[PDB]
Amino acid sequence: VMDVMNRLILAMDLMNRDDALRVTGEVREYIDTVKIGYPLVLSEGMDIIAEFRKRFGCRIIADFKVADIPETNEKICRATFKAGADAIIVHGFPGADSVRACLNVAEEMGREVFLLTEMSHPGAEMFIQGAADEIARMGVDLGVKNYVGPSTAPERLSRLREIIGQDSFLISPGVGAQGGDPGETLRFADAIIVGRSIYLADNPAAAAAGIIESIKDL
Amino acid sequence: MDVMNRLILAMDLMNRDDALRVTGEVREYIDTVKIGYPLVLSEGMDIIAEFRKRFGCRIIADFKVADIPETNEKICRATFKAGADAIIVHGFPGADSVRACLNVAEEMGREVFLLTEMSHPGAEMFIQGAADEIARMGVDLGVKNYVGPSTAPERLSRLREIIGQDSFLISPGVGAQGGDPGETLRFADAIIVGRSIYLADNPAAAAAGIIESIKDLL
Numbered sequence: 304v305m306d307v308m309n310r311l312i313l314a315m316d317l318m319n320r321d322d323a324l325r326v327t328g329e330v331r332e333y334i335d336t337v338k339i340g341y342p343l344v345l346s347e348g349m350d351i352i353a354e355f356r357k358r359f360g361c362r363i364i365a366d367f368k369v370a371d372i373p374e375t376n377e378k379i380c381r382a383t384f385k386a387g388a389d390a391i392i393v394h395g396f397p398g399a400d401s402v403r404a405c406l407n408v409a410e411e412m413g414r415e416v417f418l419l420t421e422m423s424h425p426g427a428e429m430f431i432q433g434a435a436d437e438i439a440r441m442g443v444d445l446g447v448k449n450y451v452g453p454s455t456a457p458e459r460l461s462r463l464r465e466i467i468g469q470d471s472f473l474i475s476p477g478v479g480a481q482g483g484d485p486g487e488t489l490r491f492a493d494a495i496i497v498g499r500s501i502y503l504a505d506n507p508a509a510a511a512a513g514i515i516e517s518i519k520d521l
Numbered sequence: 522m523d524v525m526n527r528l529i530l531a532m533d534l535m536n537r538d539d540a541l542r543v544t545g546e547v548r549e550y551i552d553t554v555k556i557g558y559p560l561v562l563s564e565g566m567d568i569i570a571e572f573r574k575r576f577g578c579r580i581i582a583d584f585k586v587a588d589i590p591e592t593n594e595k596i597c598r599a600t601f602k603a604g605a606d607a608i609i610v611h612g613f614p615g616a617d618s619v620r621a622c623l624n625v626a627e628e629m630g631r632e633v634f635l636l637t638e639m640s641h642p643g644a645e646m647f648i649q650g651a652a653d654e655i656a657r658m659g660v661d662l663g664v665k666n667y668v669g670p671s672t673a674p675e676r677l678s679r680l681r682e683i684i685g686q687d688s689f690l691i692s693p694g695v696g697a698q699g700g701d702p703g704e705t706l707r708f709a710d711a712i713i714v715g716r717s718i719y720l721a722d723n724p725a726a727a728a729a730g731i732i733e734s735i736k737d738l739l
């Protein structure tokens with residue numbers, strides 16, 4: 304599995320290149336893994352991945368929540384890996400063929416798929432929560448090795464870890480701004496994803512250092 | 522929304538030259554283009570303004586938005602900043618996530634389309650069982666624009682039943698995936714067509730043919 308420094312992944316959702324670069328640079332000593340999503344990519348272009356690689360010693364996880372038909376998912380993964388992403392996050396709710404499409408491109412291209420089985424926000428309760436156990440098991444059957452699950456529902460994060468087993472890699476958003484606790488989350492997740500707590504802080508570096516101090520024993 | 526010839530071009534070519542040439546080749550037949558991540562992640566969001574400059578077409582950004590409310594808001598804002606007239610949003614992540622999109626669309630004078638059900642085989646696993654509830658959620662939220670599958674006309678008909686004749690319904694899965702233009706237009710206001718046109722030896726003839734086959738529905 305990827306070796307995530309300090310078990311901490313920056314969710315860089317600032318939408319301005321200068322600010323994104325400043326904040327990421329400021330926390331570079333604490334984090335070697337950066338999640339880049341559509342807020343930043345749709346604002347600055349896919350070349351932002353190349354710039355982060357150039358500027359920082361950071362792995363890039365493209366948080367694109369890929370959720371189309373198999374043919375389109377393939378194209379999305381190809382474009383994303385071509386741009387230099389190490390990994391891509393894919394939704395499971397569109398079903399097995401759509402996930403396999405992504406797995407096949409990632410295998411061909413030497414990169415990784417993360418499967419999002421369940422989400423951290425209130426709305427996830429309406430439809431996603433009821434499908435989550437089956438989406439996770441589908442992931443296991445398809446040979447998915449990397450997963451995303453919510454820090455805001457520890458009971459459910461724990462179940463997800465059970466389903467995927469200890470060998471699978473699990474990262475978890477919803478820490479800080481959404482109410483998730485770093486320590487409690489790391490009982491089950493390999494790494495926490497943190498965005499606003501860090502990138503909106505007056506001192507992002509102090510914010511990251513503080514999160515890390517709070518989980519030192521882990 | 523008044524779509525010329527009830528025909529929306531799914532421009533999923535991933536080269537700017539080809540995308541512009543092929544769209545130019547069929548310009549006389551369409552005034553509405555669906556641009557998705559395959560083109561955008563390959564050529565950048567500036568391509569949307571380029572299409573408006575070259576063709577004057579309306580642009581539907583097919584981004585399958587499927588994140589938490591806070592991120593969805595950012596995605597919609599970036600998308601409408603780029604000149605999209607409309608954006609397509611998944612309903613599966615729940616009501617708060619859709620409302621986030623509705624908020625930005627209202628603020629910038631744009632439209633949200635709710636994807637209630639998909640056209641590919643994997644849609645059967647999780648999406649189909651939630652589809653009617655997602656459609657009702659759309660109605661509850663005041664959504665007026667919907668997307669449903671050509672490949673399952675009985676399910677497309679049910680979606681039309683739920684949302685009423687006043688709602689606007691567009692439908693992909695025509696041609697390449699097996700859907701029939703005329704049958705689809707029994708229920709959808711417009712059909713979405715990608716490969717059958719853009720991979721055609723002669724895209725203009727392809728579009729002309731499709732239109733010929735539905736000429737009594739125009």
Ligand SMILES: O=c1cc(O)n([C@@H]2O[C@H](COP(=O)(O)O)[C@@H](O)[C@H]2O)c(=O)[nH]1
Nearest residue numbers: 314422423476477480497498499589592
């Ligand atoms: O269930 C999920 C899945 C996510 O990817 N995310 C993403 O993780 C990040 C959370 O950022 P924040 O720490 O500011 O709440 C955002 O990029 C969001 O899009 C999430 O919040 N919940």
Ligand SMILES: O=c1cc(O)n([C@@H]2O[C@H](COP(=O)(O)O)[C@@H](O)[C@H]2O)c(=O)[nH]1
Nearest residue numbers: 372375531639640693694697714715716
């Ligand atoms: O259920 C759906 C929803 C879609 O947006 N689409 C999209 O509609 C288009 C279908 O293109 P095609 O005619 O080449 O099958 C693609 O852009 C695809 O991503 C779909 O095929 N099925």
